[PDB]
Design a protein around this ligand. Structure first.
Ligand SMILES: N[C@@H](Cc1c[nH]c2ccccc12)C(=O)O
Ligand SMILES: N[C@@H](CCC(=O)O)C(=O)O
Ligand SMILES: [Cl-]
Ligand SMILES: [Cl-]
Ligand SMILES: [Cl-]
Ligand SMILES: [Cl-]
Ligand SMILES: [Cl-]
Ligand SMILES: [Cl-]
Ligand SMILES: [Cl-]
Ligand SMILES: [Cl-]
Ligand SMILES: [Mg+2]
Lengths: 455, 188
């Protein structure tokens, strides 16, 4: 009677390439409206855009406390937030089978902030907590809009009354607000001199054997006015990043232009695609082809990338079926508008007794944006970075009622809150790193985003 | 049989876990501060592996105590930090290497003994270490089983007991014959 294993009801809407931005426009002002967008990227893992809004349940974690909210019921718990999330998903009594064309069939979608990692490891409290935005902000959705760029289909799915959800969607009208403007210049949380001091402290730990690689980040801040959704439309077109997202939260807006997949769980097949290695795009196409070859063959970058491959094998290996961990791709160069990135691919299999949420708990946060060994690297990041990372270098994604999951690393991600906008940029520090080159690489990764928003 | 893998808060430990499980071992992983020597006695492991990790053997929780207490009683393998800890537990000294080697492969030369039985010589291995066992300090009870191109200790074996360290990562994707190296420890 109650438990539902039945596939959701689906209405096919009109195909249009811009279907996700078109429909999301009318929802973008609503708390718990969320968009996962493939950035219109020419990319092997650019297939789906996903739209949700009007959750049946929400989970908000700030430190030790998770608030679970349903229509007329609010519960507070100090339990493991991913165990709480799994329990809430289970209690929805929606259990559809895997569908290759609908990777999210309802379920959980939202933000896992970097500081959620403090729930899984004991970390120091040196860096300042100056952004009040949840460590976890996840909605539970019994419907979704799926845009499939491979099949050119827009599917509206619902576990309830799909025709009522379609009527609700076509009843929302896009009333556009003032365009986005930055109302100050960008300022960093550190001078060139402070960056240098931190860099040199990382080198001391590398030589003492405390760590082998540390992701050290600075943060850009400006004031802004106007509509964050209009900024996202400009940025999405310029960035063409396959793990992009727009989250409207109760507290503010997350604008993600991430090119990076963290963890996919697709019918129990695990994939992670760490990005480790960067060079700027060059304007001369002959020079730029040379640049891609230089990255692929760089001894420094292949060392850093190998380390994070071995680390991601370990993180996935905490749960993977014995013998299932493989590296099908090592050191592939992917071009993005601003930069070439060096990417590797690790795969595995999830055991039947475990959940995607258990895989997320085992691995979070990404080795690619912390370092090795990970706990020591996160201790050093907290010691040297002046502020907590909050939403930046966490993950955005979904845990489908079918068991599927996909998550990003929130690099190239802006936090827009209380008329303040934040954008961070980091890089792997290793023994061969140079202080000035690593400072400059942080600017290389976000300069195009900072400059697009400045006019 | 049943292997206890002592985890020094490391990000390579579960690669050792996966390799031993693939070889057919039952493996329990415990952090270096999650176990007492009394708990180990209750688990009754057949063998113990001391994992890699940050910093030095002095920061490796129960690792030095486990090596001193189980040495000659159950087989012990030390990997990287575990290898350093094994040398230190019997009076060796851990010092900075001439050059840090972090995610770099090296050819090493060995004597085809202990975990190197049946392995190609030289062997290409991934390194993730800033520190080495000082050759001058190495206790008499250890033979050096393997050397780097610059004569750094890459492996040691106790001359009486099944107690062996390697400085490199057999479980790295770019290490040669890593499954067979660990299979030597599992099946001896
Ligand atoms: N690119 C993913 C979908 C996606 C877009 N943005 C994301 C952010 C997080 C997770 C997934 C996504 C796909 O094709 O399946
Ligand atoms: N931290 C020690 C051990 C590394 C492994 O384990 C070193 O840098 O040598
Ligand atoms: Cl906290
Ligand atoms: Cl200084
Ligand atoms: Cl990088
Ligand atoms: Cl090559
Ligand atoms: Cl970055
Ligand atoms: Cl443990
Ligand atoms: Cl020294
Ligand atoms: Cl050096
Ligand atoms: Mg780089």
């Amino acid at each position: 009677g109650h438990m539902k294993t039945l596939s959701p009801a689906v209405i096919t809407l009109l195909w249009r390439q811009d279907a996700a931005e078109f429909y999301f426009s009318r929802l973008s002002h609503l708390p718990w409206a969320m968009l996962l967008h493939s950035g219109y990227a020419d990319h092997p893992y650019s297939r789906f855009d996903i739209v949700v809004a009007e959750p049946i349940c929400t989970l908000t974690t700030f430190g030790k406390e998770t608030v679970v909210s349903e229509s007329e019921k609010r519960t507070t718990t100090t339990d493991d937030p991913l165990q709480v999330l799994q329990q809430v998903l289970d209690r929805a009594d929606i259990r559809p089978t895997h569908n290759e064309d609908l990777p999210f069939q309802g379920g959980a979608l939202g933000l896992f902030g970097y500081d959620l990692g403090r729930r899984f490891e004991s970390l120091p409290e040196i860096a300042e907590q100056d952004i009040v935005l949840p460590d976890m902000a996840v909605g539970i959705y019994d419907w979704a809009l799926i845009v499939d760029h491979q099949r050119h289909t827009v599917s509206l799915l619902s576990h309830n009354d799909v025709n009522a959800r379609r009527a609700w969607l076509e009843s929302q009208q896009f009333s556009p607000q003032e365009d986005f403007t930055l109302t100050s210049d960008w300022q960093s949380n550190m001078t060139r001199e402070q960056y240098g001091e931190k860099f040199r402290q990382v080198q001391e730990y590398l030589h003492s054997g405390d760590c082998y690689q540390v992701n050290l980040a600075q943060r850009f801040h400006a004031t802004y006015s106007g509509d964050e959704w209009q900024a996202f439309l400009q940025l999405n077109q310029a960035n063409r990043a396959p793990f992009s997202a727009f989250l409207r939260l109760e507290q503010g807006a997350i604008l993600s232009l991430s090119p990076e997949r963290f963890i996919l769980c697709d019918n129990s097949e695990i994939q992670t695609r760490p990005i480790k290695g960067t060079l700027p795009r060059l304007p001369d196409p002959q020079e730029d082809s040379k640049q891609a070859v230089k990255l692929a063959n760089s001894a420094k970058d292949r060392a850093e990338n190998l380390m994070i491959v071995d680390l991601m094998r370990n993180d996935i290996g905490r749960v993977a079926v014995a013998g299932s961990v493989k590296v099908p791709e090592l050191f592939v160069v992917e071009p993005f508008p601003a930069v070439h990135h060096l990417v590797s691919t690790i795969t595995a299999q999830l055991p039947e007794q475990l959940h995607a949420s258990d895989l997320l708990r085992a691995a979070f946060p990404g080795g690619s944006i912390t370092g090795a060994p990970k706990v020591r690297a996160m201790e050093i990041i907290d010691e040297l970075e002046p502020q907590r990372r909050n939403a930046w270098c966490g993950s955005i994604g979904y845990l489908s009622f079918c068991g599927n999951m996909d998550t990003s690393i929130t690099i190239r991600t802006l936090t827009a809150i209380n008329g303040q906008i934040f954008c961070s940029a980091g890089g792997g520090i290793v023994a061969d790193s140079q202080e000035e080159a690593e400072y400059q690489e942080t600017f290389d990764k976000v300069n195009r985003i900072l400059k697009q928003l400045e006019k | 049989g049943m292997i206890l893998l002592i985890d020094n808060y490391d990000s390579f430990t579960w690669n050792l876990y996966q390799y031993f499980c693939e070889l057919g071992a039952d493996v329990l992983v415990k952090r270096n501060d999650a176990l007492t020597l009394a708990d180990i006695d209750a688990l009754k492991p057949q063998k113990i592996v001391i994992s890699p990790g940050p910093c030095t053997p002095d920061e490796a929780g129960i690792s030095l105590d486990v090596i001193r207490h189980y040495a000659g009683r159950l087989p012990i393998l030390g990997v990287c930090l575990g290898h350093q800890a094994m040398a230190q537990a019997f009076g060796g000294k851990v010092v900075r290497a001439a050059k840090v080697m972090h995610g770099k492969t090296s050819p090493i030369t060995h004597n085809g003994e202990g975990v190197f039985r049946g392995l190609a010589n030289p062997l290409t291995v991934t390194r993730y270490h800033s520190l080495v066992v000082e050759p001058d300090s190495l206790p008499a009870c250890f033979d050096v089983t393997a050397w780097s191109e610059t004569r750094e200790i890459m492996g040691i074996r106790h001359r009486q007991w099944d107690l062996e360290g390697v400085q490199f990562h057999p479980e790295s994707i770019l290490s040669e014959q890593g499954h067979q190296l660990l299979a030597n420890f599992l099946h001896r």
